[PDB]
Amino acid sequence: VVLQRRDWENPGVTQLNRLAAHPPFASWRNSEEARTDRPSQQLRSLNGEWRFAWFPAPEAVPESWLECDLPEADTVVVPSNWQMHGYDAPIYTNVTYPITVNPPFVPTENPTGCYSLTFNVDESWLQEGQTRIIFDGVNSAFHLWCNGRWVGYGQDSRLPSEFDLSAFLRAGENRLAVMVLRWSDGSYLEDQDMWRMSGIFRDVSLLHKPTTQISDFHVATRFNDDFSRAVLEAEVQMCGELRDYLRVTVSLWQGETQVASGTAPFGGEIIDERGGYADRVTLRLNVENPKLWSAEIPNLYRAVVELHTADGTLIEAEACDVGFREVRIENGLLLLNGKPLLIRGVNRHEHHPLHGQVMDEQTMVQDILLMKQNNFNAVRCSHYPNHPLWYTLCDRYGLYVVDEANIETHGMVPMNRLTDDPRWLPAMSERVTRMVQRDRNHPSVIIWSLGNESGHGANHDALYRWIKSVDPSRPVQYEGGGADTTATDIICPMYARVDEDQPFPAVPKWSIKKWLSLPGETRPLILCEYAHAMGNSLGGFAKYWQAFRQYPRLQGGFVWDWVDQSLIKYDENGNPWSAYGGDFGDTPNDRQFCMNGLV
Amino acid sequence: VVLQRRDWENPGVTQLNRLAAHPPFASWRNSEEARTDRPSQQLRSLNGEWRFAWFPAPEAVPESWLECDLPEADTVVVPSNWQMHGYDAPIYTNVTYPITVNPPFVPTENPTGCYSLTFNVDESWLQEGQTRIIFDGVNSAFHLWCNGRWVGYGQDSRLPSEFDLSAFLRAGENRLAVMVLRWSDGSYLEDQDMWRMSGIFRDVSLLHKPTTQISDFHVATRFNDDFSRAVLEAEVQMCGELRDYLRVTVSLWQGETQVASGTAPFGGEIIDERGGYADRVTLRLNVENPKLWSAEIPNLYRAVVELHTADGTLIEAEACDVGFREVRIENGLLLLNGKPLLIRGVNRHEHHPLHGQVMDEQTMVQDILLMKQNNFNAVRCSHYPNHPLWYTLCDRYGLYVVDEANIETHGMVPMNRLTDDPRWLPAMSERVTRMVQRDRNHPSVIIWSLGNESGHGANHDALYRWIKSVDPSRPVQYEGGGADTTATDIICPMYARVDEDQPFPAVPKWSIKKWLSLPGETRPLILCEYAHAMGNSLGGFAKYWQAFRQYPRLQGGFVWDWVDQSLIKYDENGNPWSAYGGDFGDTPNDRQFCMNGLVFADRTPHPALTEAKHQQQFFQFRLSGQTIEVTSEYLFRHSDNELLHWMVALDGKPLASGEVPLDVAPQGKQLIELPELPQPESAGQLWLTVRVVQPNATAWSEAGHISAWQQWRLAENLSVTLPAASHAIPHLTTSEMDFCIELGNKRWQFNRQSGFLSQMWIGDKKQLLTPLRDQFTRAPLDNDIGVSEATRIDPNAWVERWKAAGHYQAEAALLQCTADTLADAVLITTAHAWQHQGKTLFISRKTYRIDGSGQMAITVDVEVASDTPHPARIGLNCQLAQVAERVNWLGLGPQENYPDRLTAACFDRWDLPLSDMYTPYVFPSENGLRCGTRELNYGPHQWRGDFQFNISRYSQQQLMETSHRHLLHAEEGTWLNIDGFHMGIGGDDSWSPSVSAEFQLSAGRYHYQLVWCQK
């Protein structure tokens, strides 16, 4: 049935049985634990030792592997990329796709990773409530089994996939089986210039929720003219059986002091002729003289959301960090808290020389301290959503973030072949909508980006307008198709020069001073990539900074880029050395073009 | 594998293996055949006899059915709806979904239609090229097999689905097997107010293409400032192996003359850093002084697209009709070819009373001719893409079209539950993008619509912007979420009133004049639905047309709607009758709410159609003394097939006439001086009547078609002649029970206990079957009932207010009844009070004066309590003993007319048979009123006054208690209702009170008089 359908070769199927996207949940059962961000007993990690077997194609996987472990399987650490353990070669390629271009088909020789885990679930987890599994990231596509029964299917490597496991678990020993494919139709939208690797490369978790639960919540802030009064507006949705005694409380804390609070029953205001949302509620909280969030002073509040009965009993609690800040474009300038920003930015890939594309807290913290120590205030997630912990750290230390959808089709001819085709609009919309649903509560995220190097297509206009309408609190940018199309709020060129024009057919790169003054143009200009730092480089950097400071609508840009993407290899004596494209037998490749870092 | 996946319960799977959407193709292999639109040998129909079996669910279909035919299958005609053959019931429901609301799941009891066909494919079709099957429409979802192997899966009932069959066919006998499901997750987006039916309801075709083929093409037109030069721009894409010798030619023909031509190889201009489309080409053709397309003059060119080799050999040809027209919104107005449109529009469902939702050419052509004959210029596809032939006919005859995506989620709570959810954006985008890809080359399509009644969601904004960016040549409209959101170029309310605001929470309906001027508002306003035509309706229609003509940014609207959605059933004798919701055992249902048409389901007109024709006329007339001023409302054509007939008549008798040829420029005026009119001696009102007549036949009309008319009062002479004094005196006799008056052979008898005229005799022949009594009520109209959902009752509805107050139950009490002999007459004087539970509702004081000439003069004075709801009428009724063949009257006609729907009727002398004085509305109500009447003749009786009347074989009581017209039976004699006054009929909508205050009977005191005599 599974190898009969071939869901990985069909751009119309991007998932089967996958749950709705939402902000990170821990499902505390105690308001104090939620407030102070202590670990939740209801959120269990499955990171550790799994069993793994490599196969050259999905038709080579034996049927028995769904029932029980293979003899010829190894023990591996999860999260990991399987190419960092020597099962096949990592591939470094820039523009050219690492497979024959024949969308939506992939090769029949599609390397396959089979992972499996035996784990114990407590009795109390099965008696009541809902148990879900969460894959924070799997590259590129995967099918999931539990206890031999098929659960679901996922695509997009860079965002979480959640499945309901309640009807599949049993008390005692359970077994998961994950089959992961290197190539899928999703691969055509992921042609970023980076190592092409695969596996379960971000965390795996079990979460237990009650049957009546918070299913989503968003936080918005609104200010008066001089930022001395704010209204915090929280929207909460519940799932499960609606009852008259259910209440929601939202409280806002600064350290140990409660600052604001609101309670209400379910049932919103009338939306249209048929009524309102019975399963939703909106709280408005007033805050006098709020401390504002910026990269210079990252003041944060804590918001706790409680679902309780009218007689006080707590069902479930969720929480997030809240920063009060307003971003808007007014009269051609990007303003934060009423003042014009100057972006000291850098592009940053998730890369480690030993672990490949697996991030940890320690490496993330090291990068943020070095960035701030070198006078950076902003980071661009080139070119996909990051690990969820990254945003929390940027909220706490103070960096502005540009969050980017996982879409790049650089190697198509022409570049907009898929982004102008309506048959791909379903696959592109999942990449953009799920990103906004996960990250919209982080104060550090200040701009959304529709992806990178995909030409300009009608699908980009559609998705630009989707974001402006669900989230008006942040500008949208997109560089493709000449950096100033109707799908961008900011003119955002890549590698335009200060004084010299580069007059390419259809997609010219004007000098940045000339671009500002073209007939009709009123937007601000922020370079999404400039000053390419490959080897011994950054000549002429002072010339950009002279222009940023002289011209009000030149508001800075993001350097390309933070860290060299080299990998480690060993010689005969066991001494380590830095390796780039081609050094793994990967062919064709782009040699040393993967090292462009400041560090 | 198929029943394991359950693709019909997953909004993320809308198709499997379905080909890309494109304009209609025929794949001619000869440029002459393509140019002249002859049938293609490469396009084969499979319409005809298929085999069919019905099952209660998809798990009941036997495995063998993929291999070979079932024994217990029938032979049926395709296309068809299976409910029209009695396999299950059709369901009529308005808002409530016909299944439990639990998206995306459907019930396990999901009726399933299994169709199959054995057909022969020629050898030449398999040797080379590509064979595809095309389903023009299947409701709601289906899986397809060929020769036992699974091919593909489709959803969206209203657009074509195409599958490649090349690797599945074999020479000789082939078998298709189609399994169709009534319910799917697609059903949640198709909650239109209509019959819910299923099956393969549009055509099925095989198309053969070469391996190197045209895969798509679009046509755009661009003009200079005065529309004297045009550029036609054609974009062609090919599929298959690219070669250096391939060429494309585009040529443009007007009749038999070639007008423009262009040739090029493949390879477009650079698009971006990676290059251009190697498989695409763009031709630009210049056309000097092109003939422009409009609904007034539908000039069409023919465009032929040829894929050929550099040495001349033709691979394949495609073609389409091209009309040159520019639509844009500029400075708050909708312009066509630089001139502001005024939309005379109607909403139209695809409905046939025998065939259900299956359309044919003949029915389509009949609808277009009637629309144009009644002064409509525009049609809205409510609420889904139509049959592909519909657009071709609208291109050729000239109607503007609004094309609508198949999305409606009316029964969700709230209405935007799915349209605001990102998980449904994939399913909604397929409905909008495939529609634009199929229909964008039709010149008649002038506006895209995003669907109907689905609230406002982020998915609507996204799809609005998708269309503006792929097709900037047409505006987008959408009514949901308050009719003025960011997802619409035109403010497009539904049922907003001219003068009165309706201030609902979140989604208010301002009056249309106020809406235009709200702070910030700059768009044009076109009502996407107005004047709901349910039963006896369209009161207040003139009020909209007055406002459309006065205010530049009010550019018209679409009437709801064209045709009644009734079905046919049979009785025991095999006689057909019209059926509405509930009549098939379907439950729950919405009863008669499915009949809202201007015409009956068999395309006979209701009386409201004539009111629409007059209000929408293209000539306007003013009279100043002896001069008529004729103004043209045409934008593009000179009046070259028009002459003006005038006539002057005195109380029905003609005095003078004439004809003047019209010569009036678009938007111009012509003065017409009338000859010195005759001065008559006799008393009476002079009337002038003008009519515009088309002397020559058109594509859409016969010779002598009347397209416009107007009437005015001229001079009046009041009658100062006192009646001739007769010698005879009538004789009064007084018993205990009765007053009796004799004069000649005539006799009148008044009952002293009831105080009513109880009998008249001519000779010994009794004239009445019921006494002559006051009447204050009518059999309620659909606007009086005021219900849209059969589960929900409004206490503000007229009928509920009348019933609570006791108008249908009020009993007359006699106050006074006396008789006097005057010198030359007898005078009878009566008074009555109508009561309900102590409360006096009405008082009536009458005098009857019987003179020597035999004329009875009746004078009536009525008082109405100020706190009872205003009565429906103030008049008399009786049942006459005789039945005559004809009715002759002097007053407004000849059609039924009411105080708020009488602008189209003209004052004259009318004569009709009795059966034309009754309007056979499928749900029986008050009907047949004629207003402004001075004289009525029926058999030997004559009534004179200034009154309204209806005359028929059915009492008001029988019309009130009977739910279907076929159950009415003629009573003995004839029922006559004569009214001094009558309430308006309403019809701004049918689910709230909608009679304007100037047509309510709120004066508190009323007076009228009649003379009854024997002619």
Ligand SMILES: O[C@@H]1[C@H](O)[C@@H](O)OC[C@@H]1O
């Ligand atoms: O490929 C990298 C980046 O993604 C691109 O946009 O510019 C060049 C750089 O090396």
Ligand SMILES: O[C@@H]1[C@H](O)[C@@H](O)OC[C@@H]1O
């Ligand atoms: O249901 C019909 C139409 O679709 C709706 O929009 O208005 C009322 C009418 O009867």
Ligand SMILES: [Mg+2]
């Ligand atoms: Mg790139």
Ligand SMILES: [Mg+2]
């Ligand atoms: Mg509706």
